Design an enzyme around this catalytic site. Structure first.
Site, PDB file in Angstrom:
ATOM      1  N   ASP A   1       3.761 -11.503   6.549  1.00 51.57           N
ATOM      2  CA  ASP A   1       3.102 -10.493   5.871  1.00 51.57           C
ATOM      3  C   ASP A   1       4.350  -9.933   4.833  1.00 51.57           C
ATOM      4  OD1 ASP A   1       2.300  -8.316   4.457  1.00 51.57           O
ATOM      5  OD2 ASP A   1       2.256  -7.106   6.546  1.00 51.57           O
TER       6      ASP A   1
ATOM      7  N   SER B   1       2.708  -8.258 -13.863  1.00 54.21           N
ATOM      8  CA  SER B   1       1.971  -9.214 -14.376  1.00 54.21           C
ATOM      9  C   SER B   1       1.961  -8.522 -15.943  1.00 54.21           C
ATOM     10  CB  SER B   1       0.193  -8.885 -13.807  1.00 54.21           C
ATOM     11  OG  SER B   1      -0.218 -10.515 -14.834  1.00 54.21           O
TER      12      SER B   1
HETATM   13  O1  RDV Z   1      -0.717  -0.922   4.119  1.00 55.50           O
HETATM   14  C1  RDV Z   1       0.397  -1.518   3.767  1.00 55.50           C
HETATM   15  C2  RDV Z   1       1.776  -1.185   3.517  1.00 55.50           C
HETATM   16  C3  RDV Z   1       2.766  -1.347   4.983  1.00 55.50           C
HETATM   17  C4  RDV Z   1       3.334  -0.092   5.400  1.00 55.50           C
HETATM   18  C5  RDV Z   1       5.017  -1.208   4.210  1.00 55.50           C
HETATM   19  C6  RDV Z   1       5.887  -0.918   5.404  1.00 55.50           C
HETATM   20  C7  RDV Z   1       5.868  -0.290   6.534  1.00 55.50           C
HETATM   21  C8  RDV Z   1       4.108   0.342   6.462  1.00 55.50           C
HETATM   22  N1  RDV Z   1       0.478  -3.442   3.277  1.00 55.50           N
HETATM   23  C9  RDV Z   1      -1.207  -3.666   2.785  1.00 55.50           C
HETATM   24  C10 RDV Z   1      -1.168  -4.960   4.019  1.00 55.50           C
HETATM   25  N2  RDV Z   1      -0.137  -5.753   3.960  1.00 55.50           N
HETATM   26  C11 RDV Z   1       1.224  -5.248   4.120  1.00 55.50           C
HETATM   27  C12 RDV Z   1       1.250  -3.905   2.744  1.00 55.50           C
END
Ligand code: RDV
Ligand code: RDV
Length: 330
Positions: A35, A199
């Site tokens: 991720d 972009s």
């Molecule tokens: O909702 C979020 C952010 C997560 C937060 C930022 C870091 C801590 C939690 N997305 C969507 C799914 N992929 C990752 C990014």
């Protein structure tokens, strides 16, 4: 050093991708969702509430001779789809595709929300955003990439996701056989902790390119492409019968449609997402209404170049002192 691992979609429509990761000694192999939009490496574990585990492979730190409890450390993360997970922290040896980090923070889940219990193929997440987003308290921890960076031949990793097929994450090198043409690099802002870039515009199908700045994040952990409502409306207007449905939470289209491509700009270069990459299939089994792969970001606060966009490219995450992103066609 380098590493190279195959990443595999969890189902026939690329709803998520999983990559095997070796944790501990002897190795315990878990399939993690890499991720680039978060910064915690967390796993289902022997500590996870039993009723919240449904088929996942678990990490058992007591069976790893290299695991050490990180005393007093806890973590808690809430994601933008309403999901959450939390627990305690071990350090252990973690290897991806032959690249080994010792002393990696492995965040062991004590609790996970339903969307994680329901995803039997995903044993945890491996965050690849900037370590400033890591949620461990009271001592923030580094990502796997941050820990590996200094040892790597080059301080980079690459994402080469496949459409309805496996792909590759490489660490420490750029496979020049994996893309066509040249890689166009573009500036990154790390101010919000993401691989955030701008972009240069878009085109719908064979239409003319619209030059306009679209700030967003490169997020392998997001499955779809989230763009401003104006852009998304322009795309779906080219699909007869497509509409934004209030009951579904976004754009749907007749499953009988042939979708147009969508092009996004990276500097002067252009990445073309084929129409078929934008089809996420029936909204429910047997329905003739299909989920669109391009959706509005209006309710998110940021645009998201998720898997729909990234899988059309070979993507370089350049973690040099001043980070940059690179995109090539493939
Ligand atoms: O909702 C979020 C952010 C997560 C937060 C930022 C870091 C801590 C939690 N997305 C969507 C799914 N992929 C990752 C990014
Ligand atoms: O793409 C999403 C949700 C994206 C949301 C858009 C904005 C907030 C997060 N996934 C990946 C598959 N597993 C569930 C979460």
């Amino acid at each position: 050093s380098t590493g190279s691992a195959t990443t595999t979609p969890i189902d026939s429509l690329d709803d998520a991708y999983i990559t095997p990761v070796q944790i501990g000694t002897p190795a315990q192999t878990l399939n993690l969702d890499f991720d680039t939009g978060s910064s915690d490496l967390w796993v289902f574990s022997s500590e996870t509430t039993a009723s919240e585990v449904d088929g996942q492979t678990i990490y058992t730190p007591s069976k790893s001779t290299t695991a050490k409890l990180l005393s007093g450390a806890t973590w808690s993360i809430s994601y933008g789809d309403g999901s959450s997970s939390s627990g305690d922290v071990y350090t252990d040896t973690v290897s991806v595709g032959g690249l080994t980090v010792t002393g990696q923070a492995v965040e062991s889940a004590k609790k996970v929300s339903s969307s994680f219990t329901e995803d039997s193929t995903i044993d945890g997440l491996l965050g690849l955003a900037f370590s400033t987003l890591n949620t461990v308290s009271p001592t923030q921890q580094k990502t796997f990439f941050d820990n590996a960076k200094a040892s790597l031949d080059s301080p980079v990793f690459t994402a080469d996701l496949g459409y309805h097929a496996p792909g590759t994450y490489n660490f420490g090198f750029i496979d020049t056989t994996a893309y066509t043409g040249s890689i166009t690099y573009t500036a990154v802002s790390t101010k919000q902790g993401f691989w955030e870039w701008t972009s240069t515009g878009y085109a719908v199908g064979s239409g003319t390119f619209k030059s306009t700045s679209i700030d967003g994040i490169a997020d392998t952990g997001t499955t779809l492409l989230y763009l401003p409502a104006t852009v998304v409306s322009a795309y779906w207007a080219q699909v007869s019968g497509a509409k934004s449905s209030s009951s579904v939470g976004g754009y749907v289209f007749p499953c009988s449609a042939t979708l147009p491509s969508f092009t996004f700009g990276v500097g002067s270069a252009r990445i073309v997402i084929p129409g078929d990459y934008i089809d996420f299939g029936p909204i429910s089994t047997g329905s003739s209404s299909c989920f669109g792969g391009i959706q509005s970001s209006a309710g998110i606060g940021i645009n998201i170049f998720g898997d729909v966009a990234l899988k059309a490219a070979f993507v370089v995450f350049n973690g040099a002192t001043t980070p940059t992103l690179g995109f090539a066609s493939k």
